[PDB]
């Protein structure tokens, strides 16, 4: 009767809506995962550039120490 028909229709409507909604949520999730992984990889690349940069600053400090030895040699005339 009418009560049965309402309840059957409602259960189906709700199941369809829940399937659709959770599918939309899953799609949002997967796209966020794709973006997050790509951004993580970009961050890691940027760290490699910073690490190389630190080696170059260390190199300049070494070269200034060599330069000071040359200055001392040049001043040592006698």
């Amino acid at each position: 009767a009418d009560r049965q028909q309402y309840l059957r229709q409602e259960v189906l409507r709700r199941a369809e809506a829940t399937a659709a909604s959770t599918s939309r949520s899953l799609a949002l999730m997967y796209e966020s995962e794709k973006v997050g992984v790509a951004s993580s990889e970009e961050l890691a690349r940027q760290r490699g550039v910073l690490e190389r940069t630190e080696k170059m600053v260390d190199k300049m400090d070494q070269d200034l120490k060599i330069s000071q030895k040359h200055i001392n040699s040049i001043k040592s005339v006698f």
Binding site: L12, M29, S39
Partner: protein, 65 residues
């Protein structure tokens, strides 16, 4: 069929649960990466600040030669 919807919801909820775990791992990995880079950037900034003073000072000694 109702059963097909229930089946789809169940698999969606499983995949959401697993995927949110993977997102948490990604987000924590970013957090760790940023912390590590903060350290590198701090040390790099300190070394550049000292190096600029040291290059200028060395140049002024070379001027006297």
């Amino acid at each position: 069929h109702l059963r097909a919807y229930h089946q789809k919801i169940d698999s969606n909820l499983d995949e959401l649960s697993m995927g949110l775990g993977r997102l948490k791992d990604i987000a924590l990995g970013m957090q760790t990466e940023i912390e590590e880079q903060d350290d590198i950037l701090d040390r790099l900034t300190t070394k550049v600040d000292k190096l600029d003073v040291n290059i200028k000072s060395t140049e002024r000694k070379v001027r006297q030669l």
